[PDB]
Design a protein around this ligand. Structure first.
Ligand SMILES: *[C@@H]1O[C@H](CO)[C@@H](O[C@@H]2O[C@H](CO)[C@@H](O)[C@H](O)[C@H]2NC(C)=O)[C@H](O)[C@H]1NC(C)=O
Ligand code: NAG
Ligand code: NAG
Ligand code: NAG
Ligand code: NAG
Ligand code: NAG
Ligand code: CA
Lengths: 311, 172, 172, 317, 172, 319
């Protein structure tokens, strides 16, 4: 009589790597590197905002493209390719820092600056470049200040905004650099133009320069609770009508992929979502959110069983 | 392997064994049979489950964009970002390779060890009523019916009962 | 566990053994005893001490500040620094978790192996004068007084001295 | 007759994690992540400087709070919260890069500019904002240059500092931006003001801005600028009103460990690791106090505790 | 060691065995001799070659210059680069130290296990014709000439032909 | 009485020490090094089409400094920059200097394409300076032209110059902006008109105003602000100006990819390598290396350790 001890096996086993052996056969194994991506942004459980044609900077200054996105709250913000920040030609100083700061936020609210100007200032100047409601308009949160009577000197004006909130506010402004000397004199007169912005945490001076629409370069800063920021100008300033408060935190995603409210994900990239449970990932080094780690590896099989010894 | 049983003194596995990882095959006057050992099987599965619970997991650290997809980044800070990202990736690629190679080696030897621990508790149960054949079997020197074979598997085989009969057959 | 002794064929530990990690308990005509094995106890402790010498240690690399506590920093380079630091923190947190888990596994299994190696040493000493009961004990088939027991512990037991007597008692 | 092999156990076991088990009981375990800190800057064996009320930039321009910190050597420099850099209203361009350079240094030495001025210039202009010794004073390393006669035009002046040293020197200066046109005329005169600063490696031009936007208590402001004068190179200040000119230039000596922290000094303990809250003196390899540390430190990890087993499996009963 | 053989019950190595890693020494009436075991030697060597193939290797990632050797980099960027370079070096130095310490521990324990495996293989072959002396030898209780010794080394020794003679010698 | 067979292992008289998880002084039969400590202190260029720039600086080869006359064009897979490399003969500074140097070092060759700008009779283009000496006489940057008025004092005419990218690969174009030392100098070269320089295309758009006394004076000479950008295939770049521009006579294209090596150590075609650093070269199969943390190529990782011995054998238990 006999009793024999033994172990199971399978006909078709799986190859794994060990410390010792490249080609070790085992009864079962499982993948640790995810290779597939969903070609969409999985937005289930997320109060998201798809900006579409609106560029994040554009919702602070207020281009026509961003009229639906001037305020709101979100936990996720999606930026698309070729989104419009500027109707009238321009460039923001520290463009990328401002974009990323907006794309880290979980909302925007707008606060009136309350700025008032004398009778010799026309504040309602528009342009055919910023079209809204099939008519000439301008950036919704700014005002182009000009001399009311064409040719006259713009008066030395002082406008000061105080932050009365318990949170910091983001304030923007433009500086019109005229194209020719004729335009400069028609808009602001023949005087020396001197624009001066200043607070506790910020101070700068801007002198417009001469030399087919012209430029408007944008600037920005944060204004801390209880602090004032003061604009001293005599022509050239594109003054704010409202300031912005960035509310809480959120996840900025840059992707052309469509939104799907049926799937959930915590990790995103340019080409969509990566909602695997696996620890590793070979799809992209550029991701955001809570992600598996990128590895230069096609497959990596963890063994879930003994050696397979068939016969 | 490390513990000498699986791909060792056991010549091969049993494809017919589908209700367990480790088990018994007997033969006596009544015929033959097969049965899976629950505890050794479950001991090996539980350790792999625990191994999977640790490894199939990601960090809950929220990362954000430091490279714009849709615009040019500064050439200085971009080469720094690329070099950093590539350095991190080589570390994780290395760390993942080593993790799985190490875990795989341990898994194999761990399962090898539970086969041996099953074989060893049987040897000690049988005591002087049987002898090892070198292939994983125990030649039992007494009539051991289906109810006797059950008690070896159930861990209630009393060697005292069959000791006198067995010692005589061994010496002959 | 890997070697099958601790949390294996030895049912449990002894709270009363407070002068060693491993040891002996015996029964003979005289009465009972207890003693610790110094060598195996010290072999385990020395190996654990080795781990603590390697692990409980930091690098001597001098890191200077790249983040201001009291002033603001450039937002873009601040984001790169946050990404780099959080990436490095994920690497070290993973390396710490793995290290300790890998060492805890190896510690527990090393301790188990020293227990088995002691048992195996004692099995070979006793040779054909005793048999294994499956619980970590050896039933000795002769009178073994405290001088005899001590000789098993201190590794001076000659099997020749009791072989004839023991083989008679075993065959019965 | 029996001889039984066995192992020890304890009543009070401790839980650790292994490769295969989250809740593994063992006889003994030791912590690997440090959770506690000393609320103290352990400064034994360090030639250290506690700036206290003095901001690093204040050391270069000579603000009243920084009078004890104008020169020296150190291997460790401690900056504090809300430290003063300016007695008179103003700020420095590229401010944070300057503070970083100073906190990286192992000392400051001061070399005279040797700047002389013509008889129509009063170089001893003071103000009640920078009080010192119960009297109106000014930044100790700079001079507020004004016209001797109230109203007269400030003369077209030139000043050249040459670097005789074999290492680079840090030269700072200021530009006065007056409050009213009355101030601008009373100090510098009615002429248009040009300030020019030029070397082999630097050039810029400055124009005072009368009626500056940010003000406090009816005062003007004074903005600081800086650059490095290379060995052998000359730097020339051309000005006719509004320059705040350097009496001395600075030289940063070697290297040291900059610390930003709130915690008080203790000269009785050593330490090699520092953070906002104090010193970390642990022998443990990991740490969960802060990701922001300096010196030789245990690595930061996102873990409250991580127990290393120092004993076998605990099998009671 | 883990498996109790090398630096364990085997008291020392043989410096004279230059043609293999593991082997046999015999003693019979005709004299004594020595021979290496090929199969267990290659088992150990093949596993070490496997470690070397995996470790003696470099990543195909190509890295480019981010710091300039012959000109001054920006102050704030350099600090970030320096902090990140020292952090990465600390990670790799730790990984390198851990890799080799872990690998060395496994190598010597693996080599230990191969010794035990050959010993257990021989133990099960000889069956009841021999007894363990506790020092890696088996005392064979029948006449075993040079070709009988070679059958043990070649794994073709049939216990049953010598079983009657051996059992008589063991009881007397 | 009874016969016997004994199991055993080999050993050696002197074993090697290695570190394990539990033992700092573990003796084994054999071991092998994993950290490379020796560097060949020469640049190893056996299987490499190399270009040693010597005295030439990479930026110098785009603008055409006298030091970079030999290296104005060519192809390579490896480019070796040296210490104290000359970029500028006439005092100048390039915007994004380090970025432009890295792009030239990442490239595998440069070829020069004529921009073909012509200028009217009232513009003097071929003016030289003694700061850039060439062939024992006064010269200038070969790939640039200092444009001034023909007659001293007269106003510089409103000139337009356009370059179209005729190639399928993108071209790199450079130009200077002269900010005069004085009003006297401005009038002598460009006249009394207010100066303005415009550069325009699809890719790049920027305007430059020359100003009196804006830049430093190295040996009494006004320092030139060099600028640069990329013209995409098919696209036009329009220079519109009226005095102050130092315009290109030639453009550059970056041919593929290559390896930049900054290293003052000597060249040697006897030795071969795939990894380099300032001190020399790192030829090794080992995974780790302790020569330098700043290397380039396909390199072993840098560790802060002298030696790490990997055991290739059992415990040595000698007799
Ligand atoms: C880098 O990370 C730090 C720490 O997470 C950020 O600073 C915190 O920001 C939150 C708001 O998101 C504040 O409520 C905390 O008070 C800040 N903590 C500290 C310690 O400063 C910081 O904002 C991040 N940097 C950037 C550029 O986004
Ligand atoms: C083997 O692993 C696969 C996943 O790779 C799984 O689907 C399957 O259920 C496993 N087999 C078992 C548990 O028998
Ligand atoms: C960074 O890497 C990406 C792809 O690997 C590349 O497109 C980009 O040009 C790189 N950045 C720099 C500055 O070379
Ligand atoms: C074990 O625990 C004791 C206290 O019960 C402690 O003093 C000792 O340091 C621990 N052992 C080790 C090796 O850490
Ligand atoms: C970076 O480290 C090097 C030495 O490795 C040092 O010379 C240099 O000053 C450091 N860079 C900065 C910006 O401090
Ligand atoms: C040690 O092993 C190496 C390969 O890793 C081998 O080339 C060498 O010859 C061995 N050393 C000795 C002394 O045999
Ligand atoms: Ca952030």
């Amino acid at each position: 009589d006999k009793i024999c001890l033994g172990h199971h096996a399978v006909a078709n086993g799986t190859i794994v790597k060990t410390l010792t052996n490249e080609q070790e056969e085992v009864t079962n194994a499982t993948e640790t590197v995810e290779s597939t991506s969903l070609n969409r942004l999985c937005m289930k459980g997320r109060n998201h905002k798809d900006l579409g044609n609106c560029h994040p900077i554009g919702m602070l200054i207020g281009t026509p493209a961003c009229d639906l996105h001037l305020t709101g709250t979100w936990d996720t913000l999606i930026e698309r390719k070729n989104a419009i920040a500027y109707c009238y030609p321009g460039a923001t100083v520290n463009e990328e820092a401002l974009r990323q700061k907006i794309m880290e936020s979980g909302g925007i609210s707008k606060i009136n600056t309350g700025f008032t100007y004398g009778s010799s200032i026309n504040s309602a100047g528009t342009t055919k470049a910023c079209m809204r409601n099939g008519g000439n308009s301008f950036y919704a949160e700014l005002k182009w200040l000009v001399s009311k009577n064409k040719g006259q000197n713009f008066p030395q004006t002082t406008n000061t905004y105080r932050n009365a909130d318990t949170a910091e506010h983001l304030i923007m402004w433009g500086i019109h650099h005229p194209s020719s000397t004729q335009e400069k004199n028609d808009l602001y007169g023949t005087q020396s133009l001197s624009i001066s912005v200043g607070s506790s945490t910020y101070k700068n001076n801007f002198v417009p320069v001469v030399g087919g629409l012209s430029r408007i370069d944008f600037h920005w800063t944060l204004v801390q609770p209880g602090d004032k920021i003061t604009f001293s100008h005599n022509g050239g300033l594109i003054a704010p009508s409202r300031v912005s408060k960035l509310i809480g935190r959120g996840l900025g995603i840059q992707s052309e992929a469509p939104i799907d409210n049926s799937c959930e994900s915590k990790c995103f990239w340019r080409g969509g979502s990566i909602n695997t449970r696996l620890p590793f990932q070979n799809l992209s080094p550029r991701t955001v959110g809570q992600c598996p780690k990128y590895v230069n590896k096609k497959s990596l099989m963890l063994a879930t069983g003994m050696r397979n010894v068939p016969e | 392997g490390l513990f000498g049983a699986i791909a060792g003194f056991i010549e091969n596995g049993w494809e017919g064994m589908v209700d367990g990882w480790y088990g018994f095959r007997h033969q006596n006057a009544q015929g033959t049979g097969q049965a899976a050992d629950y505890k050794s099987t479950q001991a090996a599965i539980d350790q792999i489950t625990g191994k999977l619970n640790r490894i199939i997991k990601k960090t809950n650290t929220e990362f954000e964009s430091i490279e714009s997809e849709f615009s040019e980044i500064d050439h200085q800070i971009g080469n720094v970002i690329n070099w950093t990202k590539d350095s991190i990736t080589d570390i994780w690629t290395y760390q993942a390779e080593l993790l799985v190679a190490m875990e795989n080696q341990h898994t194999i030897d761990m399962a090898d060890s539970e086969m041996l621990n099953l074989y060893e508790r049987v040897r000690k149960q049988l005591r002087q009523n049987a002898e090892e054949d070198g292939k994983g079997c125990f030649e039992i020197y007494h009539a051991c019916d289906d109810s006797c074979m059950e008690s070896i598997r159930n861990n209630t085989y009393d060697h005292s009962q069959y000791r006198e009969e067995a010692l005589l057959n061994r010496l002959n």
